[PDB]
Amino acid sequence: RVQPVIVEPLAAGQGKAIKAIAGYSISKWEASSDAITAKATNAMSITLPHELSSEKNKELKVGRVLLWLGLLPSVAGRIKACVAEKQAQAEAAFQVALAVADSSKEVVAAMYTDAFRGATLGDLLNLQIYLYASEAVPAKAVVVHLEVEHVRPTFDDFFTPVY
Amino acid sequence: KAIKAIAGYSISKWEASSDAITAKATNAMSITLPHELSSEKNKELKVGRVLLWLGLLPSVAGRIKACVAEKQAQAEAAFQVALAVADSSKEVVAAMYTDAFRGATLGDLLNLQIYLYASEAVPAKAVVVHLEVEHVRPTFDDFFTPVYR
Amino acid sequence: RVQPVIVEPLAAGQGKAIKAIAGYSISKWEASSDAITAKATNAMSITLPHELSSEKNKELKVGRVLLWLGLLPSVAGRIKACVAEKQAQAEAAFQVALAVADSSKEVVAAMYTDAFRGATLGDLLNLQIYLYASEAVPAKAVVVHLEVEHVRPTFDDFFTPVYR
Amino acid sequence: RVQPVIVEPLAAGQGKAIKAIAGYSISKWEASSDAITAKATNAMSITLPHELSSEKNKELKVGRVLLWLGLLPSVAGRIKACVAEKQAQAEAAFQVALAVADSSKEVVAAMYTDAFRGATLGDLLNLQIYLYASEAVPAKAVVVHLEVEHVRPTFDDFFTPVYR
Amino acid sequence: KAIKAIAGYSISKWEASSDAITAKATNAMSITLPHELSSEKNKELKVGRVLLWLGLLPSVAGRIKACVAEKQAQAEAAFQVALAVADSSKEVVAAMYTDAFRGATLGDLLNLQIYLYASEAVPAKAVVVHLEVEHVRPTFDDFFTPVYR
Amino acid sequence: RVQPVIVEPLAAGQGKAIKAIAGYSISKWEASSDAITAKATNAMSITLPHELSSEKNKELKVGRVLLWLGLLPSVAGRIKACVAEKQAQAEAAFQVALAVADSSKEVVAAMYTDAFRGATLGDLLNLQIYLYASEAVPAKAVVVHLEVEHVRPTFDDFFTPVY
Amino acid sequence: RVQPVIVEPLAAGQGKAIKAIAGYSISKWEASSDAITAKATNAMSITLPHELSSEKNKELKVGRVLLWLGLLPSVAGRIKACVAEKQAQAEAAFQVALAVADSSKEVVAAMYTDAFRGATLGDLLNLQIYLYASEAVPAKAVVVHLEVEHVRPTFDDFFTPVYR
Amino acid sequence: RVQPVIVEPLAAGQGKAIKAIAGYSISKWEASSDAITAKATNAMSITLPHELSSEKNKELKVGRVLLWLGLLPSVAGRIKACVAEKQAQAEAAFQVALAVADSSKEVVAAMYTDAFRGATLGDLLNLQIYLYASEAVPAKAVVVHLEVEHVRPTFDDFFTPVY
Amino acid sequence: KAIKAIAGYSISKWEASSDAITAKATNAMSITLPHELSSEKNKELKVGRVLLWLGLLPSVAGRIKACVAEKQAQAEAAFQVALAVADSSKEVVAAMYTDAFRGATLGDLLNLQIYLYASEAVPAKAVVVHLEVEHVRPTFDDFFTPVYR
């Protein structure tokens, strides 16, 4: 039996938001970039924010991480980013990574569901973010957004002891 | 409909800009995780499917091929070993690694490299490679940091 | 009986998210690259983040690791990455490794499910990430994202004790 | 109804002892210091003890880590320590870390509960301990005590087999 | 009554002597675990509350301030970031870190430093810093070592 | 209802002894110190005894550790010790450590309940002990006592095979 | 009542095989030697294989480790090995270690059951293997086999996802 | 009661084959050797095959490993091999190893049941194989067979995606 | 009957050839695992009983003693600390380490050394040392590798 199906169009902003699993929470931070020579990859390092910079919080385990990149409307060309272990040549990181985020697609994002599940935020200090551009891109023209999920920090809802 | 991540996973998506590419040449840039996933706790998360798709400026001309692989002596041989390449001459410029890294660890992606090839001369920041990995959800993303450091 | 089917077109970033198993958490971090000569490889070692650099946290056990690499849109060529134990020749790491992440495909990632299951986080200091580039690729043009899952740290839900 | 209360004065070393959870054990070791210039930091890497240096034991999983530092009574000033992943500038490790152990307080310690839970012991080789001194402090004047908990090693209750 | 360690924990207590301190200066000495806790098995134990209290000779004069923190470029800035300092001018010369390191690992305390400040000139071995950490009990302390090595 | 309470005084030696948890055991060893310059911190390393020096016994997990320091009655000043990871400057180890043992207090000890729980004795080879003194202290004037607990060694009650 | 017994003669390699416990797996690798001066020791560090070198797999927890050493039949003398944390003098590692593998016996092996239980695999990068030779022994004349057990890697039963 | 027992003789090839435990599988590979000077030990490194060389497969946990060495009938002397961690002097590896395989015995093999249980194949890249010979042995005269067991690779029975 | 490995274990058996030995000298060669056990996953396996037995060419003369121990400064002292030696003058040339390494990790055997002693001059490849370790069975030996790399 052939079933008639209507495919309704979507607006830019209508979509199901993926929810963190029970017992975890999501930290969201961004990092601006610098100038990219054409046909060249810059390789920056992941810097945790101050809140997660403590030695207490560098022991929380990691779940899924998400990398979506937001860019100026003035820029043209093709921009591709990923996260990977630090390597000798940066371009080869696009040959090993499990998901790359391409700006030529409809959804400019990369979802890492199992590549870093079970690691630690202190181990996320060891990773790198790789940016590729087809044309010459000036400084601060792309901002990368990375959103990691980790176990909920179990002692951060207390005031500091002063008495 | 789009491909949904399986139950228990999430998808981290990030991009990497390029460098200048000589004609008939291959650059080999390493993979850097974002800051949120760079913790030692989060480098032990397992990896599912990864995706590489590159967006390029429409002014460029030639043929651009990218892949991910392990570190090699010659970069060109990486195009002979890799399980999927993304080609600009083809219909869909993408590379879907469904079983190549499924089971590997998120810290093991630092041992990989992205390989770009250009048939002609390409300036810097002219292509951007988008990669989208999926991994297990981090075990504490629903908690504020403890306020008493 | 033949049964008809309709394949839905799938937008980018619209896949099912893989969840970590019960008792585990996923730590996600990145590493930037340096300049790669044409038809060459580079080996960079995995550095744990500072939060996991404690002696108590170097004894946690590893589940699955995921390497997805993000690259600039300007770079041209074919770039392939993997992880392995450290070797004499780096190129031979592409002959032994269980999964490589080619950039000539639609999913530029590599999922190591049972290659490191049951290993320790300190043993991740003994691994290396290998990049290969088909053309001349400048520095910081690829960034590797590695995402490990590990057992959740047992004491990060408590304040530090106030008495000394 | 208001309910009166009496606060008992507490002598030194008279607190409740935190017990490791079931299936885990606590390994405790120390590291001595070198000379610190005034208003400066020093980064020293964590070295596992030899008993845990095996390949079988570098795959154990980490729970909670505890850094308590012991210092000579002659030294003056303010000394602060933390653990983190290795960074370019060491001072910035005090801006990111989840807990620091100040010496101007009553409990000179720092408890990382969920910062490294689920990491591996080999990943503790990727961490660093950071010391800051407000004044000129000589060598071996502070000693850092780090106490990790990890899964108990599965075969240390058996004699070695007698046949070769 | 004194503060009792919580169920499942024990308290390791040790001391560290000092070095010579210039006037208006800060020394930064690292933390060394004792031998019993220095094993790779025992560096994975979790940490609860830590305590720092310093005993000083009564002949000394001035003002001595100590704390624990992470490693920094300038040592003086460690007194601006640390959550508790121990001051000799105050009523109780102590520093009680209840939530600063609770959850961290016993091997992570090697990444910390003790910071001493003296207002005047202080000779070597004139103050001794006592620190008392609590941690999970080691999983084999009720067994003799196996006699057949 | 106000309840009358009598606070009875204690002698030096009356106190409840903390017991190891089930399945663990306690190894107790001491280490003598050397000369300490005034306002300076010496930083010594932890040496496991011979019984726990085997590769079999460097895999036992660690629970709570205890550091109490015993000193000569002739010495004066103020002495503070702790255990921590090895660092660049030793004095900064008193800013990171979770408990320091002060000789100016009534109980000269430091209890590390969770700082090293789950680590290994081979990882206790990586730690250091930090000593601070206010005045100049000669050699062997302080002996530090550290008492760790670990899992009970499961094969050490056998004679060595000779037949 | 006295009960007679008959002892069966046992051929080489006819012992009971020790099985890893449930949820664990045994990774086995080797390391070759270099030249040893007579009455001397050598310290070589443990390097994890590439499969366990990921950040996700450096957080796995360690059970029992086993060191059995294979040696050429031409070499003469007495050769002893152990594992420990790294020390100043290597010879003192034979005074502290919980088990040594003497070559003057019938079972040339050493079983560390609870020495590293609960440690992390990354913490195996902090350990060292110590060799002692009673006579002049050339290079590559002994090969050490170390066999760790660790938790099984949680994702090595799945293909990598095909979409990028 | 004395019981009469007949000890029946065995042929070279009759013996119970040890079976892998449930959920594991066995990879079997060999490595040829080079020239051995008399009274000297060569120390070669373990190279995983190509099938297990992937970063996906370097995360599988390890069970029991087996080393049996096969040699030419022309060679004479005494040959002893083992596996161990890499060391300063190779001969001392025969003093630490838990089982050495001697060619002078009836069963020329070495069974490592617990020495590497719980490690990883990427950690088996860190080990070494040590060969000893009494007399001078030419190249390729011994081939070492090592047979490891690991968890079964859960995604290797799929074809590669081409559509 | 022979000694059977206990339930859950297997026995890896391998050999190592020798080098040239000066008279009244001791060589110290390190232990190398085979390739199959060299993975980081398999270096975390626990060790039971190990065995060392050496086969020697019948043309050799003198007295050859071997053992396994930790790394030492002097190699001769390894014969004073080791729990079992294999002696060619004795009835059975073997060394059975039943409790010396039982509980240790398979990666810890890289921290050990084999010690050979010869009373006379011995050429290279004249003795071969066989060592047989037992360990837990690797958790995936019943699976083909995933074909989609």
Curated annotation (Swiss-Prot), chains C, D, G:
Broad class of the protein's primary localization: virion
InterPro entries, per database record: Bromo_CP
Gene3D superfamilies: Satellite virus coat domain
One Pfam family cited in the UniProt record for this chain: Bromo_coat
Keywords: Capsid protein, Ribonucleoprotein, RNA-binding, T=3 icosahedral capsid protein, Viral nucleoprotein, Virion
Gene Ontology MF terms in the entry: RNA binding; structural molecule activity
GO cellular component: host cell endoplasmic reticulum; ribonucleoprotein complex; T=3 icosahedral viral capsid; viral nucleocapsid
Subcellular localization(s) per the UniProt record: Virion
Protein family membership: Belongs to the bromovirus capsid protein family.
Domains as described in the record: The N-terminal arginine-rich region binds selectively to subgenomic RNA4.
Function description: Capsid protein. Binds specifically to the subgenomic RNA4 to ensure selective packaging.
The name this protein goes by in its record: Capsid protein
Species this chain originates from: Brome mosaic virus (BMV)
Classification of source organism: Viruses, Riboviria, Orthornavirae, Kitrinoviricota, Alsuviricetes
